[PDB]
């Protein structure tokens, strides 16, 4: 249940002494290293052609946030504030009121994407699958406040990426 790395006594016979001296003078392990580097010179490199080629992702991927809807147009979020209760960065700010037909809905739904740690506790705490964390990771901005999403930005991300988020949740939800 243990092995001794570097506990080899070298053979002091003239054969092995001459082997080590030929290794010292004629640089055997240096040619071994050159041979391994030359072996990688003739391999096909692992380089993908981004932006035209994309890295592999699973349907569990945690990227840009989105607010989803039911298949009727109605938004799924019913203002229950589980996602900001569980949010480990407190990146989520929610205010709420009954809207004009008496429905429990949000008026504020902020996510500071510069506080967000992209751990997906909000999408796993949401009882109605409203807040999700979509596949989008290519949403770098040029200004700090462009990464401070309100409800309109997240509903537009949901309406933007719904045709993909729905299929990711379809592929993954039985593991949940």
């Amino acid at each position: 249940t243990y092995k001794y790395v570097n506990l080899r006594e070298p053979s002091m016979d003239m054969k092995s002494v001459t082997d080590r001296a030929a290794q010292t003078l004629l640089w055997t392990e240096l040619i071994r290293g050159l041979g391994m580097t030359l072996s990688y010179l003739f391999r096909e490199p692992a380089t993908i052609n981004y932006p035209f080629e994309k890295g592999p992702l699973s349907p569990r991927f945690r990227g840009e946030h989105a607010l989803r809807r039911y298949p009727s147009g109605e938004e799924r979020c019913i203002a229950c504030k589980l996602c900001e209760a569980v949010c480990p960065a407190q990146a989520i700010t929610i205010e709420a009121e009954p809207r004009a037909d008496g429905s429990r809905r949000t008026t504020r739904y902020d996510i500071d994407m510069t506080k967000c740690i992209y751990c997906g506790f909000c999408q796993e705490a949401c009882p109605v699958d409203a807040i999700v964390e979509g596949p989008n990771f290519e949403f770098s901005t040029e200004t700090h406040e462009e990464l401070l999403y309100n409800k309109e930005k997240l509903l537009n991300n949901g309406d933007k990426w719904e045709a993909e988020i729905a299929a990711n949740i379809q592929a993954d939800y039985l593991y949940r």
């Binding site: 035209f52 080629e53 596949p135």
Partner: protein
């Protein structure tokens, strides 16, 4: 597709030269892919 290429090279997109008004002949962008192809291209699915 070229499934003889290794995993990562076997799917790609040759972007358009005009999308939503912008001349994207040289100014190709990673977020030019619509969401229905963003599963297939990122290998979230085997099905286009």
């Amino acid at each position: 597709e070229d499934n003889k290429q290794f995993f990562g090279r076997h799917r790609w997109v040759i972007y358009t030269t005009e999308m939503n008004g912008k001349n994207t002949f040289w100014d190709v962008d990673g977020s030019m892919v619509p969401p229905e192809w963003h599963r297939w291209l990122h290998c979230m699915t085997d099905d286009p």
